[PDB]
């Protein structure tokens, strides 16, 4: 029961050079592209001619310059991309007030989804 080449995953690849054929109980590991987050077991194993399930690569968020502008917000602690799981902090632009919910200036990027707060002229 040999396996054949491990399956592809989006935005990532195996950490080894692939083989044509793979012994039973052999394993390979995956790595995601920069700023992508591995979800699931990064290792797969060959057994009974089949591979176990490969991981997935969770997207980072590409922070919009600027939906930030038409929401009248900017980044606090100014220096962008954020990783899945990272919190990002915003401020209202000068002369503006938070018009979204009370907490919405701090938000968490997840798999490419980021909830922008909004501000409005006071």
């Amino acid at each position: 029961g040999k396996c054949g080449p491990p399956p592809p995953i989006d935005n990532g690849d195996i950490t080894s050079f692939p083989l044509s054929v793979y012994a039973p109980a052999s394993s390979v590991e995956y790595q995601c592209q920069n700023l992508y987050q591995l979800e699931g077991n990064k290792r797969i194993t060959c057994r009974n001619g089949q591979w176990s399930e490969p991981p997935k690569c969770l997207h980072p968020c590409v922070i919009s310059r600027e939906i930030m502008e038409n929401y009248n917000i900017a980044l606090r602690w100014t220096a962008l991309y954020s990783r899945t799981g990272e919190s990002v902090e915003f401020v209202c632009k000068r002369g503006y007030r938070l018009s979204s919910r009370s907490h919405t200036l701090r938000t968490t990027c997840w798999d490419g989804k980021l909830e922008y707060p909004t501000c409005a002229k006071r």
Partner: protein, 295 residues
Amino acid sequence: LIVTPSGAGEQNMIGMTPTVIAVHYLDETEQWEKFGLEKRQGALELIKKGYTQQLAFRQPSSAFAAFVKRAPSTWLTAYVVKVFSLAVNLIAIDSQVLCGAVKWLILEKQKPDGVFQEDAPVIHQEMIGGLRNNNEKDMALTAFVLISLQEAKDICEEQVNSLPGSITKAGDFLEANYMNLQRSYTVAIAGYALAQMGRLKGPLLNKFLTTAKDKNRWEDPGKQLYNVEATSYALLALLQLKDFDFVPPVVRWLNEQGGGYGSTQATFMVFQALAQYQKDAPDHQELDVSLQLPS
């Protein structure tokens, strides 16, 4: 003499460039007869020496730097890929070396929107031609690296399953920002990268074509060498488009213009472009390789 750095992992590639592209040019145009076929074998051994020497600057990551204790350069690693790719059927290129470098570029240096980023610039900035210029670096470097990935595609697609997707992502970024480009250099290098993918059409193509001066060159104010390089990229883009009518004045201008300080990129690109022109173009104009392939 003058005090200058000695990044050998970069300097070996500067040294390797004339021999590889000269052999490429003579193979592609089938002009070894006039030059002297007896010379080919020795050129091949010189290329093999350059290649073997470069291996000592290959880091465990499969990336390359001027020194083994210096962080690897994105640009240098992509240049190695491009040079080694042109050599695959000239000498034995280890696939793990070539495809290892490609995979490092993809897994470490490509940003989420497709852009390729340099985290450790080459010490010998003269070897990077027009790229040395500050602005539109995200577009210019992404095009440069994408062009190298394109050269490795067939060799490495089987070793690096992530390659086609990385190419497409870099292509997406180039297309999305091409119209906002201001430098002729960027227009030409990104134009070639897009044209190779069949993605230089419509208003993008119009911009590219109309960016030229006198329908014969792509130039920006500054070092002349950067324009020779830009225009070679544009000539290659024209050949991808098979736009053989626009071509003749460009080739005339290029031929009317090779080595020395800061000429690595111009030399590589001119010989590549003019080589392909003679290979592709019906009844081409008549166009010295001796300087690249001495004694």
